[PDB]
Design a protein around this ligand. Structure first.
Ligand SMILES: Nc1ncnc2c1ncn2[C@@H]1O[C@H](COP(=O)(O)OP(=O)(O)OP(=O)(O)O)[C@@H](O)[C@H]1O
Lengths: 401, 142, 102, 48, 70
């Protein structure tokens, strides 16, 4: 078992402006962090009794040499001569006793031994592939939901799938319904799937797991799926948690034959991932979130109940969600009275949140170009033209219809 | 790389290892100190000071050996020496002429808050010896 | 002057000592210990010297590791095999700002 | 900015790691790890 | 004695060496070099060797015991 993320450094800065409250609020936070520094600065200073001038530890120091080799603990023998192999397959039946706890003996778990006499040292090392331990994150990026706006249905769905289960199972318990496990978020690019992922990551009581889809292309043949299997094992070990996979349309796509025979072998990774997700045995208590731009291209085998219990679409904000995003973004910046956000919202269609961020930033940049900190409607009039120029479509369907 | 070792029994380890009664020799013994692998296995051991036994007749015989045998001191054929000398001096003259640029720039530079090239002791010695060879050429013979 | 030169030549005797291996620190724990994986051979656990504090050690750093006692020697930067070749910050091109077109 | 500086320095100054494990409680090496262990440590060899 | 030291330093590099690839330079008189055996060592370089030639990967011979760049 384990715990999760430990960021959240007082998310109550609620004036959000140049006010003396936020001067008072943050200086309180400075006071408690300086004291907790001073609490650990003198914590060791008090009670000179430094482990009773030392005892017991000397034995473990002397018994085990300075360097400790590692190996795989093979068949155990009661006489402490369990077989162990080094990295080069140097299998050796060797004694194993010092001031060492002999209860965590299993085939296949890494064990530590002496460089010279190959005797088992003690600390059966408890660590995993660093390629995954790096993925673990305990720093919430930004605000949970306030920033996001307009996706009431989508946020409701994701909440029901993830947050509610690990808050109150009373309903689930009494009704006997197992909460949904897999969720796949899909939609046109920039709709904000990543935004919502970060959002939940900011308010997840459990440890978060982050992975990009194109991360299991290990060069060596085989290996690979072993990576994902170990990842799932680690995630299961560390208490309940959520595993997020971005751009999943890189390891599973229509599961088509080798064709040219290159044997890309990514198909093997996809099959192993699918097996781990749902096949035989039991997954345990682990939630899964998947994000992609194209979902149809995903092979059906990966996408089915028991693996992705929810498919959540993220459409382009039309007017109301569009207005929500627009004024949410503009809030943190000074704007003029004459500005008419609704005017721009109505004027333009097929506009995504990323474009809203870009257009507001560009309007601010243009205003700075004019040397005016305050913005004007004309600033937005120029910005929305500049930003929306790359898009050029429309067949000559201008007369027949 | 030779070295001398001697073991210590594990019965008297309560007593001092090597009772020392001389600072100079003890410090000289420690000057070699102990080798990495030596510490890796220094226990049950204590290196003992070694030294080359006094050597005069052997030393003198070897010294005579070097002059005539271990390096060119036949002293009768001891004296290209006029064939390749021209070419060696040509190389070194060209090289020194080239190297003379760097001191030029160094001097050119102002205060500002690779001139050292020597290359002259070699020429000095070589061509002074060649010129001295005239002594053999004109008197020692004929 | 030339006593100094002689002393420097004598101090060049340090070349006799064999160099230390190179190992990327897989993970550093407390109590002055770190598990490192040297390239030729599998990973192991080693004790750290006094020159460098533990906190300086982080996962995925290239520690120069003592050859004999398997004790930490130093830390080294630039754990980037061919991509530094693409870094090419050096060799600045011409100051073509003025001679750009209209 | 001083909040972030204090947070970084206190995260450095925590040092509550000490993942030092593997030893047995002093009730079994009581008559065990004492002499025979190190009395056989050099002699008791290893067979591949 | 100075001349003796100089000639000893020059001799230091004459002994048969082992080829290998220099990896990079840490600081003057020190560097990291990879051997033909594949292992990567942290060694020193003599003051005689000249830097610009050392900087590129290229190839270099090491002392079979000290492994120092020569
Ligand atoms: N409705 C919105 N409200 C607030 N911010 C939004 C909204 N829509 C988009 N954004 C912001 O604009 C960004 C652009 O979209 P994003 O980068 O999330 O792309 P995506 O395709 O949805 O996800 P990914 O980048 O993982 O493919 C969002 O991440 C978010 O920061």
């Amino acid at each position: 078992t384990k715990g999760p993320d430990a960021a959240s450094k007082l998310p109550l800065v609620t004036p959000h402006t140049q006010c003396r409250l936020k001067l008072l609020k943050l200086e309180r936070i400075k006071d408690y962090l300086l004291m907790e520094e001073e609490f650990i600065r003198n914590q060791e200073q008090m009670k000179p009794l430094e482990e009773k001038q030392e005892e017991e530890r000397s034995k473990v120091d002397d018994l085990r040499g300075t360097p400790m080799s590692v190996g795989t603990l093979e068949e155990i023998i009661d006489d402490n001569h369990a077989i162990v192999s080094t990295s080069v397959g140097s299998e050796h039946y060797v004694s194993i006793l010092s001031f060492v706890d002999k209860d965590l003996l299993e085939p296949g778990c890494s064990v530590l031994l002496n460089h010279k006499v190959h005797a088992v040292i003690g600390v059966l090392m408890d660590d995993t592939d660093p390629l995954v331990t790096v993925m673990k994150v305990e720093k919430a990026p930004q605000e949970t939901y306030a920033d996001i706006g307009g996706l009431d249905n989508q946020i409701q769905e994701i909440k029901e799938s993830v947050e509610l289960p690990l808050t109150h199972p009373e309903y689930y318990e009494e009704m006997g319904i197992k909460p949904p496990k897999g969720v796949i978020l899909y939609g046109p690019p920039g709709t904000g799937k990543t935004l919502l992922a970060k959002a939940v990551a900011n308010q997840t009581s459990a440890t978060f797991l982050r992975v990009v889809g194109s991360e299991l292309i290990q060069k060596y043949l085989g290996d690979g799926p072993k990576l994902v299997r170990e990842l799932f094992r680690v995630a299961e070990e560390h208490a309940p948690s959520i595993v997020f996979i971005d751009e999943i349309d890189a390891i599973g796509t229509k599961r088509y034959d080798s064709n040219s025979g290159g044997e890309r072998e990514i198909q093997r990774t996809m099959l192993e991932l699918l097996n781990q997700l749902d096949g035989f045995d039991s997954r345990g208590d682990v939630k899964v979130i998947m994000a992609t731009n194209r979902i149809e291209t995903l092979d059906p085998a990966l996408i089915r109940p028991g693996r992705i219990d929810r498919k959540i679409e993220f459409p382009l904000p039309d007017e109301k969600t569009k207005k929500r995003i627009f004024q949410i973004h503009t809030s943190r910046m000074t704007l003029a009275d004459d500005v008419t956000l609704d005017d721009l919202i109505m004027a333009k269609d097929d506009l995504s949140g990323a474009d809203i961020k870009a257009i507001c930033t560009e309007a601010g940049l243009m205003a700075l170009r004019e040397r005016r900190m305050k913005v004007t409607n004309e600033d937005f009039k120029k910005s929305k033209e500049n930003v929306l120029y790359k898009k050029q479509e429309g067949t000559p369907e201008g007369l027949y219809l | 790389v030779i070295d001398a070792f001697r073991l210590i029994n594990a019965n008297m380890m309560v007593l001092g290892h090597e009772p020392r009664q001389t600072t100079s020799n003890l410090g000289h013994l420690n000057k070699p100190s102990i080798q990495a692998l030596i510490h890796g296995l220094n226990r049950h051991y204590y290196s003992i000071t070694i030294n080359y036994r006094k050597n005069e007749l052997e030393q003198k015989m070897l010294l005579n050996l070097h002059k005539k045998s271990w390096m060119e001191g036949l002293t009768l054929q001891d004296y290209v020496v006029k064939e390749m000398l021209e070419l060696a001096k040509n190389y070194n003259k060209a090289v020194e002429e080239e190297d003379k640029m760097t001191p030029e720039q160094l001097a050119i530079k102002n205060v500002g808050k690779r001139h050292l090239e020597e290359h002259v002791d070699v020429l000095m010695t070589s061509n002074i010896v060649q010129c001295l060879a005239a002594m053999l050429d004109t008197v020692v013979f004929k | 002057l030339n006593a100094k030169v002689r002393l420097l030549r004598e101090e060049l005797q340090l070349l006799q000592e064999q160099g230390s291996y190179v190992g990327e620190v897989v993970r550093a724990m407390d109590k002055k210990k770190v598990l490192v994986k040297v390239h030729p051979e599998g990973k192991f656990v080693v004790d750290v010297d006094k020159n460098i504090d533990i906190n300086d050690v982080t996962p995925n750093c290239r520690v120069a590791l003592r050859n004999d006692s398997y004790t930490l020697h130093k830390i080294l930067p630039n754990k980037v095999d061919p991509l530094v070749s693409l870094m090419m910050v050096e060799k600045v091109p011409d100051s073509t700002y003025e001679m750009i077109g209209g | 900015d001083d909040i972030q500086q204090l947070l970084k320095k206190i995260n450095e100054l925590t040092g509550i790691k000490e993942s030092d494990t593997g030893l047995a409680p002093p009730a079994l090496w009581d008559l065990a790890a004492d002499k025979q262990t190190l009395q056989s440590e050099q002699p008791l060899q290893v067979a591949r | 004695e100075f001349l003796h030291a100089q000639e000893e330093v020059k001799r230091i590099q004459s002994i048969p060496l082992v080829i290998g690839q220099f990896l990079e330079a840490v600081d003057q008189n020190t560097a990291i070099v990879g051997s033909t055996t594949g292992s990567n060592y942290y060694v020193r370089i003599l003051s005689t060797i000249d830097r610009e030639l050392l900087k590129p990967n290229a190839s270099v011979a090491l002392h079979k015991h000290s492994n120092a760049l020569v």
